[PDB]
Design a protein around this nucleic acid. Sequence first.
RNA 1: ACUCGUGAGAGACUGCCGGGGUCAACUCGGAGGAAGGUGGGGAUGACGUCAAGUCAUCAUGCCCCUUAUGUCCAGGGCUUCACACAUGCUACAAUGGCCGGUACAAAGGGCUGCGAUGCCGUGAGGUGGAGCGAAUCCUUUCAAAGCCGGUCUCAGUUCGGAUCGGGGUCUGCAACUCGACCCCGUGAAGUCGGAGUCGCUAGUAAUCGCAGAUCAGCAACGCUGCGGUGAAUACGUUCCCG
Lengths: 126, 126, 153, 100, 82, 116, 207, 98
Amino acid sequence: PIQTVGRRKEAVVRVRLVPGTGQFNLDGRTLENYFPNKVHQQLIKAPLVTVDRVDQFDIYAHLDGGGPSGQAGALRLAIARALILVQPEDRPALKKAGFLTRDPRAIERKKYGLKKARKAPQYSKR
Amino acid sequence: MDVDVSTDGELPGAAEYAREKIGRLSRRAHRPVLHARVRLTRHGDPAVERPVIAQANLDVNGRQVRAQVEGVNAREAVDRLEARLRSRLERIAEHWEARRGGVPAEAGREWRHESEPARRPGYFPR
Amino acid sequence: PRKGPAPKRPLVNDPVYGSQLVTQLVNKVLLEGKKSLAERIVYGALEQAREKTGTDPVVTLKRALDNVKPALEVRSRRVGGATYQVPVEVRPDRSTTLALRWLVNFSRQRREKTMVERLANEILDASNGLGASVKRREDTHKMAEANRAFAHY
Amino acid sequence: AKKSKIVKNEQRRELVQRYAERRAELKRTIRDPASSPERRAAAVSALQRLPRDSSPVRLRNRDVVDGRPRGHLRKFGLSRVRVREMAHRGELPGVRKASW
Amino acid sequence: PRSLKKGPFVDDHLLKKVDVQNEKNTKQVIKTWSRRSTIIPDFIGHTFAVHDGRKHVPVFVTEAMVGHKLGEFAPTRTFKGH
Amino acid sequence: ARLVGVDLPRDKRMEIALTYIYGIGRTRSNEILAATGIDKNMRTKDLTDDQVTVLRDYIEGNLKVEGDLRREVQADIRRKIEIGCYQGLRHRRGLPVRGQRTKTNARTRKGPKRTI
Amino acid sequence: GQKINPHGFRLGITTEWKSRWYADKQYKDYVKEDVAIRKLLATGLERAGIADVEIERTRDRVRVDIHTARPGIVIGRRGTEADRIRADLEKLTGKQVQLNILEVKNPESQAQLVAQGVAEQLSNRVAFRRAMRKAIQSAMRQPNVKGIRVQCSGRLGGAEMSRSEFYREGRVPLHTLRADIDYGLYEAKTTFGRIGVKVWIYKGDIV
Amino acid sequence: QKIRIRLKAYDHEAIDASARKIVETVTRTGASVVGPVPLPTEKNVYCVIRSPHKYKDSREHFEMRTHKRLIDILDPTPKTVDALMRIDLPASVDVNIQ
RNA sequence: ACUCGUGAGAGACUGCCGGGGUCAACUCGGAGGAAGGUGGGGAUGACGUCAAGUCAUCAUGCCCCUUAUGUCCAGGGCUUCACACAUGCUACAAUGGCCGGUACAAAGGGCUGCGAUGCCGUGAGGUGGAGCGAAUCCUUUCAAAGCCGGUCUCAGUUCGGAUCGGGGUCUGCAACUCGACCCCGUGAAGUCGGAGUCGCUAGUAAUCGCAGAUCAGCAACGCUGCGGUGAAUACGUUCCCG
């Protein structure tokens, strides 16, 4: 077997890929019971559609941390990593399309003296 | 023109004199005054030759005007403050009479920063 | 913007219609980051438009955009210490942005009891050439023309 | 602050240690169960008889060296002014500046 | 307000003052300093000199004012307008 | 339909229409509708005369609303006034009575702003 | 507020905590007794330059190590000074307290001792330029010193106006983390007020 | 029967050295160990104001970090017990035996 | 085995390629790579200025009080209100209100503290005490916006919650002046705000919740952190400010 990880702004996805049918088992739930957002499902399946290996891989995925969007992004990255591990000669397609790049966008730390990371208190000149 | 005076400690009659002197500057301002505040403060140390310090702040249609002086008593400080504020208001005018001399104008003369650049043909004059 | 132009964000194609313009539309109607609600609103509006007309919604959306897309806009210019309203040609991206913003706003103050219905009616009348956004484009073109004397700088 | 006020707290502590250990708590342990006969007990009146300094409610933790009554930190028992200078000199173990 | 299990709160000083006041069925003016005590039906006729911060204001109890505190009838801050 | 001297709205669900009685809010309406058996989601024009009379006698039975409640409230405020208590004179001069700050806010008791 | 304390800048990198112990429930009273010990030792000993005081705690037994430039002053030849310090440290409820009195190898390379000496010289009669120059030359004469800066502020020379003066020799890289900057501060008692003296000393890098 | 050894210190280097020394001692006595299992570092954060009086917007942050190590042994021969109660460690690190 | 936790290390150095370049700095693009050109964010603040702030953290020269300006106690005040200014929160609604079901976090705290199961109250809450100095137990197994279903049909309303009447709970010696919270009723202004003005360039603004310190209780809508969802726009330096 093979196992990869996807990490998207603290959302961690552990995946397990076998050559079964395109069924999605996400922590004992399916792709529709989970992820009831069409854009999210497209985001998951995009590496498959650009690699055209749809409905020919059984997927077991572990989800922990973050919200649905971060989980979806980490899941897509994990799928891309599993694909490159399984079929190395597809790397140009996945890399050019940007699915092999971990997204280094994290919640910016809140700073003292400011209400938010960048938002500043209203200052009155008068 | 409504002015609020925020003194401190001992300064009898300073508030009324300051309010009446400052409120006469409303007509001198070329734009409506949104707010006007005056603060009177006396230095505790007897060694200070000019103990009384007066400050003002006027919101001249969003433009901040402020001045600060020192004096030996309330009357002198207020009068010097009025003179200083009048000077600042004169320098702030920004209506047409205030900027008619600064208009680059001077057709082909008195090169200024905003003077209209000369139009140049593609070919050399010769 | 003092040191030079800034990179653009390559936002992705919509999954269920496959066009860039619908994603631009959802990001225009978006509020407070509630993307799902915006997508629901726009999909409902497009399906309403398809039901009323009977054809694909994207073609009618493009027709409405072209009906409301502007070409000439007026900006305040300061030359030689004086400000005038100068008519300026509009780059394609700015024209599409203006069209989308006008559509969203003028649909926001319609009177159709729901955002979906207001948006659908606005896009339909824009496709037909009767919308208030079309009127806004008419006024902006008239304003640009009335100041054609100042186009020389 | 004032040495009078600095020392005024310690007698409150030893009074609380003298009283609140069992006398000012056994009465409360009787008021808790409604089955307990509180009305003829009049232990509410008895607890009122006790001096106010027996009450921990009047206790005011101050700077253990300076007597400053505000900006107190329980971990060190120190004022905010004092901990900042004492940490910079490395006198509190395992304390340093933060960065993340 | 105070919980009902604890019961009404009255300081012992004025409590024993009023109970010896009513044992011989005459009410004199009682000088008190506890604004936090509650009005209890044994005060019904007694006139209290409740402290204000500067002086003591005479307070004659009636039926309606039972259940309140003596401080309800000794106003502290004085204001007449600007 | 006239209930306890109050006309109902023309088309509202029952409990919310019952809130239009002065002594009745959302909780009271729900609980009285649950007790007296009429369903809560029925409109105000589908009611029968028997439904009206069962609401009428139940409300007159274990509730106080409208004139009696208003006069009781006014009597309570007046009695609080005449005993000279703190809240009394607080009511007397139209200032907040529950310790609210009066340096800036409390226009509700003060009314609209007046300039001097 | 311009510069943070150099010891606190490199606390987790170059410098070390001056009190080594661990406490979970008893952190507060440990801190209280520590500061009590520090103030007692600062008050009692002033003739010899007390450069640094360390405290190590382990259950009952407490270890207080102090560095001085003149150990003989602080120790009784029969233990008289040792007896006195041991006794009033027993009085400080330190249970069993044992003391390791130590000596600084090169007094002129220690910033705290330098500030102590300059402050003492300033207090009696000495012009401040003389004191700063003498200290700078003495510390520069030391083999390992790479840069020293001396600054003292206040009513210098008994004047009515306060002034700040500083002389530097060599390199004093206050912004560099790996550079170990020895920082020392001490207030001089004059008849006209209080004069604050600070010393920075640079002695290469540590890696 | 196994006895738990818990380590807590403010300095990671000292706690690592203590862990390795304890492991060396218990292996000297002839025991079976698991190894210095690392545990999450506890972080206590404090924020203060720099100036004594005003200047609130200027704050300084401090933190206290505690490092935890877990030592577990098996086959507790009395020689190992006696060796455990004959170990000297820096005053910074405390050892919890359970 | 895969995460994860925490120790050691590698990895970005214009390293390489191509072109501009004085063959110089530098600069443009490409490849490889997780990341490309000080990667993102912190900590770090030169000589000085403004006699800026602080004798009320502390220390301190000089002056002053010393049957008091020192000190102990009860009560009161710091919460006063015709107004004015400033920072915020909640709204004026359908991109919503209400009801039912249902999914995903991080960080942090806890010994005379966290406090679970159960039972009793409608609800604050009461009784009771399991297990926990805690990667273990408790903070519920942790969220809310989100998703699904119903209802409301554009109204000063099923919006909005101020004010006020009544009744309670908890802490505390004691909630009158002057606490928080719960229940019933009451249902104000408010229909998107003039002149003018503020913040923000990307995981940012906007929006949603969670935690901590101080703390018996809390006036916390404040401050310091943590994560969830997540935009638009930048043509360009003529004008405003530094």
